[PDB]
Write a protein that binds this DNA or RNA. Structure first.
Ligand code: CL
Ligand code: MG
Ligand code: MG
Ligand code: MG
Ligand code: MG
Ligand code: MG
Ligand code: MG
Ligand code: MG
Ligand code: MG
Ligand code: MG
Ligand code: MG
Ligand code: MG
Ligand code: MG
Ligand code: MG
Ligand code: MG
Ligand code: MG
Ligand code: MG
Ligand code: MG
Lengths: 224, 213
RNA sequence: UCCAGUAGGAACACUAUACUACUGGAUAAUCAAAGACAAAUCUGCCCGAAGGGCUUGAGAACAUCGAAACACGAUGCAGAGGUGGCAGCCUCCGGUGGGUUAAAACCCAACGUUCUCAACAAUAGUGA
């Protein structure tokens, strides 16, 4: 309603490096609630990480993060912070702060959540993507249909946008979620399916945007 | 030491109207300090149930929670389109706190076998120094599937990754891509590349493959 | 302090008196609300010379509440019967969730302050 939480301070950081999130709280006196941070790694579940208690100001952390992080609150600024030291790629995630409801109103449930800040813990550098065509061979064909698309390899950070023919082609287009390679860079491919007949007459070009590197590529996929 | 919350199942498919049930077992008494949350892709979780069985204010009454001993289940009388989402139980009886693994409630639809396409590395990417082989399972259901790579009939291992789409807003199907990565050296040696797909839709594993050049 | 309604009134029961608690009131003390020891005497092990606490008061744990998981403060207000203790089971009462609904009428489910100590358990009448 008027109660609201807005975190900030997330960004890119080398491993072992350090970073401090803050959670600005409006709509209520932060000092009468209990604040928690909770994180969610890409494609993983929620993980409770730390909390602070009203009145006592007691502190509580999760095994996986105990010792390296510290939570605290500034009454004056009505804000909560999370000091994150000795970060490791392992720690990459989205970090939400959440407040505990009032005992009478919502027991110990976390009733209000932040939008979340993204904390990326990499030691890799910003790179534009390579874009290779996935040529529609006779081994990428079924019935009167043939699949094709382009591989978007080795880039960082996310995200990347992809379209086909400026965006006039959207039927049967699947663009897969990015995948963090072991090289440290990302990767993903967009594919589409189309009438085998059109292959000879119709053109197919995948437009690839990558703001983070002001890169903009347009590979023309075509039967080899 | 630390209390565990074992949620199940991990995924679950239902139709509008269905009565859906998600269960969560605590590794030891938690009294009633359990909450349930709904979450939707890339968005803050939302409180549904608190204190084990109390419906959080604002939440639709079709949602409910109950407690038998150390077992906690969240129910939905009558599944609604907005309810397709993921759900988490959470215990707040003891520190540190813990959430269940999560339960994704997906849309049910009739089985569909995947189409299977295979793409060899482009000459371009070869000139570069590495080789990626892409295997595409397209428009299929349910989600559980199985892709194995084999070069010269050797079972590849820990040298390929895969990615999966969301249910298609159109036909509720999934599409999945598996990518195999070789050094140009490894690649240039072997001749025949293949992926084997196992899906409930196929009465026997599909093998799609090609030969270098 | 008083009055009323109700529930208790504490070594087996019952009643009266003292005395207690909740609710409403003020000598015209209203009209109310509320009201769980009903049925049944279960199973296994251990202990005593003899097993039966709707009583208070204090210390611990634990719980509820105080913007409150700990720390700080206040409160113990709901659990009951199956006779000592432990464990189990059945029933009752309670709020809670679900089911069926006109309806917690009825059905399902788990869940509900314990331990330690001291004092008091009356006077009387009637009875196992
Ligand atoms: Cl709670
Ligand atoms: Mg090798
Ligand atoms: Mg009186
Ligand atoms: Mg009496
Ligand atoms: Mg009074
Ligand atoms: Mg009786
Ligand atoms: Mg004896
Ligand atoms: Mg008795
Ligand atoms: Mg306590
Ligand atoms: Mg105050
Ligand atoms: Mg009993
Ligand atoms: Mg007894
Ligand atoms: Mg006995
Ligand atoms: Mg007993
Ligand atoms: Mg009952
Ligand atoms: Mg009901
Ligand atoms: Mg009981
Ligand atoms: Mg109680």
């Amino acid at each position: 309603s008027e109660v609201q939480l807005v975190e900030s301070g997330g960004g890119l950081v080398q491993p072992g490096g350090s970073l401090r999130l803050s959670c600005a709280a409006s709509g209520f006196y932060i000092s009468y609630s209990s604040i928690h941070w909770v994180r969610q790694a890409p494609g993983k579940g929620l993980e409770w990480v730390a909390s602070i208690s009203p009145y006592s100001g007691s502190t509580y952390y999760a095994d996986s993060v105990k010792g390296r992080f510290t939570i605290s609150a500034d009454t004056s600024k009505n804000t909560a912070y999370l000091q994150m030291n000795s970060l490791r790629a392992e720690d990459t995630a989205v970090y939400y702060c959440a407040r505990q409801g009032y005992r009478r109103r919502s027991g110990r449930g976390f009733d209000y959540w932040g939008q979340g800040t993204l904390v990326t813990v990499s030691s890799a550098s910003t790179k534009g993507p390579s874009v290779f065509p996935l040529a529609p061979s006779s081994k990428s064909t079924s019935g009167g249909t043939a699949a094709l698309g382009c591989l978007v390899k080795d880039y960082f950070p996310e995200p990347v946008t992809v379209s086909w023919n400026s965006g006039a082609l959207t039927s049967g287009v699947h663009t897969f979620p990015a995948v963090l390679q072991s090289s440290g860079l990302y990767s993903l491919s967009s594919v589409v399916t189309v009438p085998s007949s059109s292959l000879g007459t119709q053109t197919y070009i995948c437009n690839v945007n990558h703001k983070p590197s002001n890169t903009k590529v347009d590979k023309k996929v075509e039967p080899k | 030491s630390d209390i565990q919350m074992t949620q199940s199942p991990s995924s679950l498919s239902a139709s509008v109207g269905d009565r859906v049930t998600i269960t969560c077992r605590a590794s030891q008494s938690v009294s009633s300090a359990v909450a349930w949350y709904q979450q939707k892709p890339g968005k803050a979780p939302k409180l549904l149930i608190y204190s084990a069985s109390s419906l959080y204010s604002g939440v639709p009454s079709r949602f409910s929670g109950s407690r038998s001993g150390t077992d906690f289940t969240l129910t939905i009388s009558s599944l609604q389109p907005e309810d397709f989402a993921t759900y988490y139980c959470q215990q707040s009886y003891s520190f540190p706190s813990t959430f269940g693994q999560g339960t994704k409630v997906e849309i049910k639809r009739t089985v569909a076998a995947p189409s299977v396409f295979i793409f060899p590395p482009s000459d371009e990417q070869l000139k570069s120094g590495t080789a990626s082989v892409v295997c595409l399972l397209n428009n299929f259901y349910p989600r559980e599937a199985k892709v194995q790579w084999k070069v010269d009939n050797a079972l590849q291992s820990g040298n390929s990754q895969e990615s999966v789409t969301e249910q298609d807003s159109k036909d509720s199907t999934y599409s999945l891509s598996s990518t195999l990565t070789l050094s140009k050296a490894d690649y240039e040696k072997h001749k025949v590349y293949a992926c084997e797909v196992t899906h409930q839709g196929l009465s026997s594993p599909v093998t799609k493959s090609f030969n270098r050049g």
